[PDB]
């Protein structure tokens, strides 16, 4: 069962430089070519490099848009495929995947974030949102989750400890003046909170943040 | 720079219905006889690409007889039968045939189902928030069909939107819905000059704007 992952994302600066790494397992890694692709939401999927075989004297490919400035290379000993970037510039920003095909098959790994910007790291400020009125009197009710100005991307935001799982619809970040707001709702019955606790955890990594936000009634 | 196209950009369908889903190229992607190296993947929210369909119509590992793939020339096409429930998501075409590497814009899948009206609650800022001297009103329209909808805020009844911040999700995978998430930012200042705040959906369940809203 082939898998591949992508490692080494990250925020990094214009002008600056950052290596992605990409290890494989379930195969014979040194058999087969190997790519990176890279999407963004504005401009979809993006072949920017290829690596073939030792025998191939391990040719490259490369997209001319990237062409001196990355450099794909491959370690067959430990089934592992790199991604040397340089000079990056904010248009480089997006998921970086690495792929293994041939001519029966195609696997992608699950990809890993790569923000190139000049904005600075920034905790962001976690907020419970509780009803007025309140929905606990019609059977069920909805609570929320703010999590306002952060920098970069990646937060991770659970109820209960990811114990509640359902009912739960977690709204995609938006960035506005180089800092992020993301929000997210949990839906229970009446009879549930507020006399049994409902937690928001939040955490956003970069800034090495963890919080648990207890939705208070009133 | 090979061109890949496809169509639709959008495709609604109904449970066991049929999905036809169109991709073309610039050019011959023949690489050699029994070799022309177009795939098919799905991509689901939040996901990797998954291979479908490789080399035009060869189905890939677990991936049911339902999905036929065809085409040649610089015409290919996907075709479901009996489309499920976890069939949503964004499929995409790429040939492996010319460096380099191209892929199609994606044409993303839609379930459809019964219209729903959303469910609108709305929260006044928290003291947290307050307490550092901001004010941000929240709404939240969930589980709605279809994803079309307009939102708007009204402060002390005059329409006010300034500070606000929309975002949507995908369509739910068990309930094919969509949710909707809209923030409206005040300085507690701000904040505090008026009383009556009010969410305001338009939405084609109803034709009236359904709205939810409070006094501070």
């Known amino acids: 069962e082939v898998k591949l992952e992508e490692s080494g994302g990250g925020l990094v600066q214009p002008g600056g430089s950052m290596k992605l790494s990409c290890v494989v397992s379930g195969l014979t890694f040194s058999r087969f070519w190997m790519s990176w692709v890279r999407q963004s939401p504005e401009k979809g999927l993006e072949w920017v490099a290829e690596?073939?075989?030792?025998?191939?004297?391990?040719?490259?490919h490369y997209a001319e848009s990237v062409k001196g400035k990355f450099t794909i290379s491959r370690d067959d000993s430990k089934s592992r495929l790199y991604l040397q970037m340089n000079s990056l510039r904010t248009e480089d920003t997006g998921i970086y995947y690495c792929?293994?095909?041939?001519?029966?098959?195609?696997?992608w790994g699950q990809g890993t974030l790569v923000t190139v910007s000049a904005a600075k790291t920034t905790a962001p400020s976690v907020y419970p949102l509780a009803p007025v009125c309140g929905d606990t009197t019609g059977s069920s009710v909805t609570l929320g989750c703010l999590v306002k100005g952060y920098f970069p991307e990646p937060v991770t935001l659970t109820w209960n400890s990811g114990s509640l799982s359902s009912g739960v619809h977690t709204f995609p970040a938006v960035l506005q003046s180089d800092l992020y707001t993301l929000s997210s709702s949990v839906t229970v019955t009446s009879s549930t909170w507020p006399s049994q606790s409902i937690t928001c955890n939040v955490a956003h990594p970069a800034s090495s943040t963890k919080v648990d936000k207890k939705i208070e009634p009133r | 720079e090979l061109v890949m196209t496809q169509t639709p950009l959008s495709l609604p369908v109904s449970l066991g219905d049929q999905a036809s889903i169109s991709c073309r190229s610039s050019?011959?992607?023949?690489?050699?006889?029994?070799?022309?190296?177009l795939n098919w993947y799905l991509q689901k929210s939040g996901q990797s690409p998954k291979l479908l369909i490789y080399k035009v119509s060869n189905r890939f590992s677990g991936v049911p007889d339902r999905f036929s793939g065809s085409g040649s020339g610089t015409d290919f096409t996907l075709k479901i039968s009996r489309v499920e429930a976890e069939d949503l998501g964004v499929y995409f075409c790429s040939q492996g045939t010319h460096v380099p590497y191209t892929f199609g814009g994606g044409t993303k899948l839609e379930i459809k189902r019964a219209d729903a009206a959303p469910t609108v609650s709305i929260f006044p800022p928290s003291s947290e928030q307050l307490t550092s001297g901001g004010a941000s009103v929240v709404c939240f329209l969930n589980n709605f069909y279809p994803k079309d909808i307009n939102v708007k805020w009204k402060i002390d009844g005059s329409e006010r939107q300034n500070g606000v911040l929309n975002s949507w999700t995908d369509q739910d995978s068990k309930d094919s819905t969509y949710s909707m998430s809209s923030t409206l930012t005040l300085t507690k200042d701000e904040y505090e000059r008026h009383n009556s705040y009010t969410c305001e959906a338009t939405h084609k369940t109803s034709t009236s704007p359904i709205v939810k809203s409070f006094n501070r």
């Open positions: 050019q011959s992607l023949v690489h050699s006889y029994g070799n022309t190296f």
């Open positions: 690596i073939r075989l030792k025998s191939d004297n391990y040719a490259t």
């Open positions: 792929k293994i095909y041939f001519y029966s098959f195609s696997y």
